Design a protein around this nucleic acid. Structure first.
Ligand SMILES: O=P(O)(O)O[C@H]1[C@H](OP(=O)(O)O)[C@@H](OP(=O)(O)O)[C@H](OP(=O)(O)O)[C@@H](OP(=O)(O)O)[C@H]1OP(=O)(O)O
Lengths: 51, 97, 266, 69, 49, 50, 48, 48, 50, 186, 133
RNA sequence: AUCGCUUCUUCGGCUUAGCUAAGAUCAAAGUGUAGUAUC
């Protein structure tokens, strides 16, 4: 619930501002979120502290 | 036990199967002496309750006679010797139990 | 005396059909209704004659009388024979009346599905869901799918589950879709329950619930064998080399040799 | 006779809902594409816009009365 | 026997014609049979001592 | 020892190996008692432990 | 049926333990002073 | 009638007909599986 | 038993496999046999022919 | 016979009567008899759901839809809204209130648009805001709708007090935006 | 099986008990009078009282008290057996009343004798029975 | 649109004749008679 709130707020702001002649000063907030999400997806179970 | 089974059942039933309940009784007794836990899984458990009463009732009579014969044997000066081997068998089982 | 030839004769389905056709031609509506209504009373009418009767009243535009002509037909026959009457009744109602009369329309489907045998139940559950989706409220439409996979029975329950999976996902997202995957795996037959296990593992691994994904695969592995289901073991192996480690890769190989031993009694 | 006709209404369900090919991504919309109240909100929207049009007519008098004094 | 066979051939080619169309034919047969034969089927369709 | 059904002749998992080493530290040499808990029996415990 | 006569509830107040087997007799003396009981422990016990 | 569906007796001991009734059923009476074993954690305190 | 049940299941499935072309043909064979109806009789009353 | 039965039987046994009675009317009822029996069947069928679980908000919404389409007498619809509303969620976390809150908004819409008793729609909102656990969460919809309602009564002083205590109890972005958009329109 | 008999101590009348029913009979003919029913256990005791009470004890340990004149049942006591015996052993098989008829003695499969006594403290107004023919 | 004999498969029903100290106990080898296969 917290995640989808923050995401929808940020994406809506992106669609309002972007497409203007002085864009490119803005770090691509929706697409960079996509890029971050696909990078984080590779993950593994850690072993054990005792064994 | 036979009278109790026939009364336990109500009417119109397989009652020749009542003879099979006496087999379960004898097994419940043998398991008691072995100290193996007797538990038939599917049993008509009002039948189980009745068998468990009669097994425990025999176990009481069987231990009480084991005590009584041994007390006689301590006083024993008599030709006990078959009663001795019986009573040694029971007391061996009661110890291991 | 009731001589059988004339005493039977009024049970005349060829002749009642010919009589009804002439009343459509020359009777005008009110006499034609009496003829069909008598044909119902006799129990001579075929389901084709009920549908012909309704189409007559519909073409006249006595639409409300057409609906009761179907209704009376539904009282006449029993399944399978009613099925074409229900198909025509429920679609015909749904078109004109189906928006405003929706409160009445839900009573038709309930009245159908209470009697419906599982194999015919598939299509009628889906038109009920269409009505309740577009006009009705959303939770009621989803509840019909929960009812559909119970009613349809085992050869095609899989189709009802995959609709339910898609439609919950389409509105409430994958996080609310989790319980009905677990119901499916526990309920639809083993060929599809394995397939649903792969489906469910794909969700948990894209969300990153990799510890849940293992228990999905491991719970599916016990009703799979490595001698013919190699595609299941390959996809688990490709998962465990990606998202796993030595301590759980060996756990995979333990259940593999355990499960094959179950089948490989030779 | 169109014995199949029930199938013609449910064709959208039979075609695009009766199966799903794959899923292999997620995004902020897919996590929650509609709010859990979306259909209660839908049933209010016809009535809610009458209130809106009364509000726009009401606020026009509030301005007009302020400038009348 | 001939009359029995005329009913057997009549229904079987009706299956064939529906099958030549490619259809549900047990449903099609269900149309005509259901009025009378459902009355006939109602006739067609421990505790020991 | 060998031929009874339920004698569990399969590989030693993680928790069975955990329990066996935990119990070897707890008991010392009690192996007939250790055998019921791990139910892998007496010989299977001892050869695994060694 | 007709009109139950009212009778007071019955309440318990003894457990006399001392047979070493089932009890299966009681009789009360004419004198009402003592009752006898007989048991599957093959012993008759007379109680006051 | 089902409530009195008495299972047939399968002895570990007697067998006067000499029947073979052997592997699965004879163990199914055995009941060994039901009593699990667990031990007081005092033993860990004693050892260490 | 595992060899026999594997074979028997296979032969059950193989008979069930394509249980329609045979049935539709055997239905077709029966249908056309009945509809062909009268075969020629070719009677033998040779003393009438005499 | 069916109609006689419905009276003396009314709650429990009518469940059988209504299924036959509605089939009966499905022919002969067609204009007036069908819609009467199906709605009255539906009415008692929703009351069964409410006796099972008064927490079934979807049953109350579907029930209130039936009665409004009936154009049921106002006092009966008020009694049904006020029965529905008394089922305050036991969890006191906003995820559970999201369906329950429209059970109040629909009541205020009914009182404003259908009953046209604006002095009673004030009381619906005051009763609503006296029930929300504001120090834990708020529905900005309530404070917004209550504010705009007083603007339709031309009472800016009331509307500002509503939005003012909204920000004072729970300063929330949806409130600020609505209050600012209001003062911009003014 | 008719495991128990009792002759009512001041009427020409006797009762007999089986798992089926407890039946009442008029002597000497032996003609039948209405049954005391619903105590569907293996019964084997009856005691009957000078005041008109009959009591039936059952092999399952349950114990019913009845009014002879009407066959109304107005006590069900379930015996609880003394330590180390609970489930099977609860059963009853003896009963007698003392000669006054104010104490009941029962003998028990739990190897105990138990004795019962009548409550007095506020009974008749709290308990009542109506008419219900 | 009513009609009959037979074969087959297929479902439910369809019996361990006590007890005790498990009643007690653990040699195998070589000589004589009966059964099966070949000339
Ligand atoms: O808190 P905010 O950032 O101002 O978000 C609000 C608020 O959302 P919260 O649940 O986070 O408070 C509203 O929710 P409610 O408080 O009214 O429950 C919500 O309204 P809905 O729940 O009806 O969606 C509205 O969204 P909308 O304006 O589309 O109704 C949304 O505003 P944002 O669009 O600015 O996030």
């Amino acid at each position: 619930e917290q995640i989808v709130k923050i995401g929808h707020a940020s994406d809506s702001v992106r669609q309002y501002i972007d497409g203007t002649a002085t864009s490119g000063l803005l770090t691509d907030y929706t697409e960079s979120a996509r890029a971050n999400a696909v990078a984080a997806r590779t993950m593994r179970t850690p072993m054990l502290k005792d064994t | 036990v036979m009278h109790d089974i026939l009364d336990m059942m109500p009417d119109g039933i397989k009652q020749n199967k009542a003879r099979v309940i006496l087999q379960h009784l004898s097994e419940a007794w043998r398991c008691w002496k072995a100290n193996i836990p007797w538990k038939v899984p599917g049993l008509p458990t009002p039948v189980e309750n009745m068998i468990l009463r009669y097994v425990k009732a025999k176990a009481d009579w069987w231990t009480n006679s084991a005590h009584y014969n041994r007390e006689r044997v301590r006083r024993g000066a008599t030709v006990d010797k078959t009663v001795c081997k019986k009573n040694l068998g029971r007391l061996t089982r009661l110890y291991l139990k | 005396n009731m001589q059988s030839v004339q005493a039977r004769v009024h049970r005349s389905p060829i002749l009642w059909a010919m009589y009804a056709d002439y009343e459509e031609c020359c009777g005008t509506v009110e006499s034609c209704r009496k003829v069909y209504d008598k044909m119902i009373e006799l129990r001579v009418a075929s389901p084709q004659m009920i549908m012909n009767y309704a189409m007559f009243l519909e073409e006249n535009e006595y639409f409300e009388l057409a609906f009761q002509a179907y209704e009376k037909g539904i009282a006449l026959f029993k399944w399978p024979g009613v099925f074409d009457i229900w198909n025509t009744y429920l679609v015909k109602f749904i078109k004109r009346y189906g928006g405003k009369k929706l409160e009445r329309a839900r009573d038709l489907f309930e009245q159908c599905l209470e009697n419906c045998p599982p194999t015919h139940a598939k299509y009628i559950f889906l038109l009920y869901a269409k009505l309740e989706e577009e006009h009705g409220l959303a939770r009621h439409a989803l509840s019909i799918y929960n009812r559909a996979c119970s009613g349809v029975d085992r050869a095609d329950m899989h189709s009802m589950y995959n609709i339910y999976i898609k439609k919950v996902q389409e509105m409430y997202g994958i996080a609310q879709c989790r319980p009905i995957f677990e119901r499916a795996i526990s309920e639809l037959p083993e060929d599809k329950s394995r397939a649903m296990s792969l489906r469910y593992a794909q969700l948990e691994t894209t969300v990153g619930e990799i510890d849940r994904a293992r228990a999905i695969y491991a719970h599916a592995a016990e009703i799979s064998d490595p001698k013919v289901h190699v595609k299941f073991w390959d996809t688990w192996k490709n998962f465990e080399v990606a998202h796993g480690n030595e301590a759980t890769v060996r756990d995979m190989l333990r259940v593999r040799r355990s499960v094959e031993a179950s089948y490989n009694v030779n | 006779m169109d014995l199949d006709i029930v199938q013609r209404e449910i064709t959208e369900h039979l075609k695009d809902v009766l199966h799903e090919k794959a899923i292999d991504s997620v995004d902020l919309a897919m996590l929650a594409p509609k709010k859990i109240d979306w259909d209660l909100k839908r049933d209010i929207e016809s009535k809610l816009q009458k209130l809106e049009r009364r509000t726009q007519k009401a606020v026009a008098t509030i301005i007009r009365q302020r400038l009348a004094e | 026997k001939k009359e029995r066979d005329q009913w057997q051939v009549k229904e079987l080619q009706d299956r064939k014609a529906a099958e030549d169309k490619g259809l549900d034919y047990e449903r099609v047969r269900s149309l005509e049979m259901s009025a009378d034969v459902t009355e006939k089927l109602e006739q067609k369709r421990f505790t020991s001592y | 020892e060998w031929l009874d059904p339920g004698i569990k002749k399969t590989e030693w998992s993680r928790e069975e190996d955990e329990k066996l080493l935990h119990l070897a530290k707890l008991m010392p040499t009690q192996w007939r008692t250790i055998a019921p808990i791990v139910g892998r029996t007496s010989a299977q415990c001892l050869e695994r432990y060694e | 049926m007709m009109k139950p006569k009212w009778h007071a509830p019955w309440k318990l107040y003894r457990v006399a333990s001392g047979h070493t087997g089932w009890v299966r007799a009681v009789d009360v003396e004419p004198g009402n002073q003592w009752f006898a009981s007989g048991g599957a422990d093959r012993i008759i016990k007379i109680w006051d | 009638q089902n409530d009195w569906k008495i299972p047939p007796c399968i002895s570990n001991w007697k067998n006067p007909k000499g029947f073979t009734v052997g592997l699965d059923k004879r163990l199914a009476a055995d009941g060994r599986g039901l009593q699990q074993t667990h031990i007081n954690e005092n033993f860990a305190k004693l050892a260490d | 038993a595992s060899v026999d049940e594997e074979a028997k299941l296979k032969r059950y499935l193989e008979k069930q496999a394509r249980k329609e072309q045979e049935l539709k043909e055997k239905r077709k064979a029966k249908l056309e046999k009945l509809t062909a109806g009268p075969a020629k009789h070719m009677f033998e009353d040779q003393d009438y022919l005499s | 016979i069916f109609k006689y039965g419905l009276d003396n039987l009314p709650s429990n046994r009518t469940e059988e009567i209504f299924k036959h009675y509605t089939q009966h009317e499905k022919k002969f009822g067609e204009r007036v008899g069908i819609e009467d029996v199906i709605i009255s069947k539906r009415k008692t069928q929703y009351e069964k759901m409410v006796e099972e679980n008064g927490y079934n908000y979807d049953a109350w919404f579907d029930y209130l839809r039936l009665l409004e389409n009936e154009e049921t007498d106002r006092e009966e619809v008020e009694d049904v809204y006020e029965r529905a509303i008394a089922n305050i969620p036991p969890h006191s976390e906003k995820r559970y209130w999201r369906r329950y809150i429209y059970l109040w908004i629909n009541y205020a819409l009914y009182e404003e648009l259908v009953a046209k008793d604006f002095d009673r729609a004030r009381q619906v909102y005051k009763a609503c805001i006296d029930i929300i656990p504001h120090k834990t969460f708020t529905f900005a919809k309530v404070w917004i709708m209550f504010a705009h309602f007083e603007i339709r009564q031309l009472d800016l002083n009331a509307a500002r007090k509503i939005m003012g205590v909204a920000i004072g109890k729970c300063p929330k972005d949806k409130l600020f935006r609505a209050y600012i958009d209001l003062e911009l329109q003014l | 099986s008719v495991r128990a008999l009792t002759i009512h101590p001041r009427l020409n009348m006797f009762a007999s008990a089986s798992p089926d029913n407890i039946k009442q009979w008029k002597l000497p003919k032996g003609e039948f009078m209405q049954n005391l029913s619903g105590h569907n256990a293996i019964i084997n005791t009856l005691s009957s009282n000078d005041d008109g009470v009959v009591v039936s004890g059952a092999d399952n340990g349950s114990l019913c008290f009845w009014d002879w004149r009407s066959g109304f049942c107005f006590q069900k006591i379930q015996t609880k057996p003394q330590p180390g015996s609970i489930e099977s052993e609860a059963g009853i098989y003896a009963s007698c009343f003392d000669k006054t008829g104010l104490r009941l003695i029962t003998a028990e499969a739990d190897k105990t004798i138990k004795m019962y006594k009548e409550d007095d403290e506020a009974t008749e107004e709290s308990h009542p029975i109506v008419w219900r023919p």
